Amino acid sequence: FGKRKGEGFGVDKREVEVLRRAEKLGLVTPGKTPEEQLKELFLQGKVVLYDGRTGEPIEGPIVVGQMFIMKLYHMVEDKMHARSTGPYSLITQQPLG
Amino acid sequence: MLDSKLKAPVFTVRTQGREYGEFVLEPLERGFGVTLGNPLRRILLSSIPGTAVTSVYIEDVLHEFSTIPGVKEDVVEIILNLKELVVRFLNPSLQTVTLLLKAEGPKEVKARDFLPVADVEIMNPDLHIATLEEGGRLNMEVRVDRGVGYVPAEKHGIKDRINAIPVDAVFSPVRRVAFQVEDTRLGQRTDLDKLTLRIWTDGSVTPLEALNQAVEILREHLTYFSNPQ
Amino acid sequence: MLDSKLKAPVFTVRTQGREYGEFVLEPLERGFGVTLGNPLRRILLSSIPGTAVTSVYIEDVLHEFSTIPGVKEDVVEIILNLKELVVRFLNPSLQTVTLLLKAEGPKEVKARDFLPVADVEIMNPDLHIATLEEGGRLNMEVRVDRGVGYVPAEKHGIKDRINAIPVDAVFSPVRRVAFQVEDTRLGQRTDLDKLTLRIWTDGSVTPLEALNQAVEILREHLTYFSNPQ
Amino acid sequence: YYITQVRKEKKGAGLEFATPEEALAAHERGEVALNAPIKVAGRETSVGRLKYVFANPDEALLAVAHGIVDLQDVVTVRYMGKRLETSPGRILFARIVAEAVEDEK
Amino acid sequence: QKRKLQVGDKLANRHGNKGVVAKILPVEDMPHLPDGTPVDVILNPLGV
Rounded (to 5) percent helix, strand, coil in chain C:
20, 40, 40
Q: Helix (H, G, I), strand (E, B), or coil: what is residue D70?
A: coil
- Whole-angstrom CA distances from C84 to C46, C79, E48 are 18, 9, 48
Separation of alpha carbons E32 and B157, rounded Å: 33
CB-based contact C151:C168 (threshold 8 Å): yes
Separation of alpha carbons C202 and C174, rounded Å: 6
- Whole-angstrom CA distances from C217 to B41, B44, C93, C203, C214 are 19, 21, 21, 21, 5
Residue type, C209: E
Do E11 and A69 lie within an 8 Å CB cutoff? Answer: yes
Do E28 and B152 lie within an 8 Å CB cutoff? Answer: no
Of C212, C207, C186, the C-alpha closest to C8 is C186
CA-angle at B56, arms to B50 and B62, nearest 5°: 160
Q: What is the CA radius of gyration of chain C?
A: 23
CA-angle at B22, arms to B17 and B27, nearest 5°: 150
Q: Which residue of C has its CA nearest to B41?
A: C35
Reported resolution, Å? 2.4
Separation of alpha carbons A68 and B118, rounded Å: 46
Q: Which residue of B has its CA nearest to A11?
A: B182
Please check whether residue A5 touches E, CB under 8 A: no
Residues of B in contact with A56 (CB under 8 A): 34
10 Å CB burial of residue A24 (0-12, 13-18, 19+) is buried
Of C136, C165, C142, the C-alpha closest to C153 is C165
Domains present along chain C, CATH in parentheses: 1-49+172-225 (3.30.1360.10), 50-171 (2.170.120.12)
Of A54, B212, E14, B71, the C-alpha closest to C34 is A54
Bridge partners, residue B38, by sequence: none
What is the phi/psi pair of residue D74, to 5°?
-80, 105
Q: At what angle do helices B33-46 and C207-223 cross, to 10 degrees?
A: 80
Alpha carbon of A57: minimum distance to chain B alpha carbons (Å): 10
Separation of alpha carbons C188 and C191, rounded Å: 9
Q: Is the dihedral angle over the CA atoms B87, B166, B171, B119 positive or is it negative?
A: positive
CB-based contact C132:C71 (threshold 8 Å): yes
Mark whether D and E touch (3+ CB pairs within 8 Å). no
Instruction: Report the Cα B97 to chain-centroid distance in Å.
Output: 16
Pick from B22, B41, B181: CB nearest A13: B181
**Secondary structure (DSSP) of C13-70:** EEEETTTEEEEEEEEE-TT-HHHHHHHHHHHHHHTS-EEEEEEEEESS--STT-B-TT
Eight-state DSSP code of residue B74: B
Q: Helix (H, G, I), strand (E, B), or coil: what is residue E10?
A: strand
Choosing among D66, D70, D71, which should be mutated to test the A contact, i.e. which has the most A CBs within 10 A?
Answer: D70
Residue type, C7: K
Do B64 and E35 lie within an 8 Å CB cutoff? Answer: no
Last residue before each gap in chain B (C to N over 2.5 A)? none
Of C28, C189, C113, D67, the C-alpha closest to B46 is C28
Residue type, C38: N
Of B221, B214, B217, B216, the C-alpha closest to B41 is B214
Q: Find the helix or strand (DSSP H, E) in which C75 lies.
A: helix C75-83
**Measured torsion, CA atoms of residues D1, D2, D6, D9, in degrees rounded to the nearest 10:** 140
Bridge partners, residue C162, by sequence: none
Method: X-ray
Please check whether residue A31 touches D, CB under 8 A: yes
CB-based contact B107:B130 (threshold 8 Å): no
Pick from E11, E38, E39: CB nearest A72: E11
Residues in chain E: 48
CB-based contact B153:B167 (threshold 8 Å): yes
Residue type, C50: G
Separation of alpha carbons B22 and B35, rounded Å: 18
Q: Is the dihedral angle over the CA atoms C108, C145, C16, D66 positive or is it negative?
A: negative
10 Å CB burial of residue C74 (0-12, 13-18, 19+) is middle
Separation of alpha carbons B101 and B125, rounded Å: 13
**Secondary structure (DSSP) of C179-191:** EEEEE--BTTB--
Please check whether residue C31 touches E, CB under 8 A: yes
Mark whether C and A touch (3+ CB pairs within 8 Å). yes
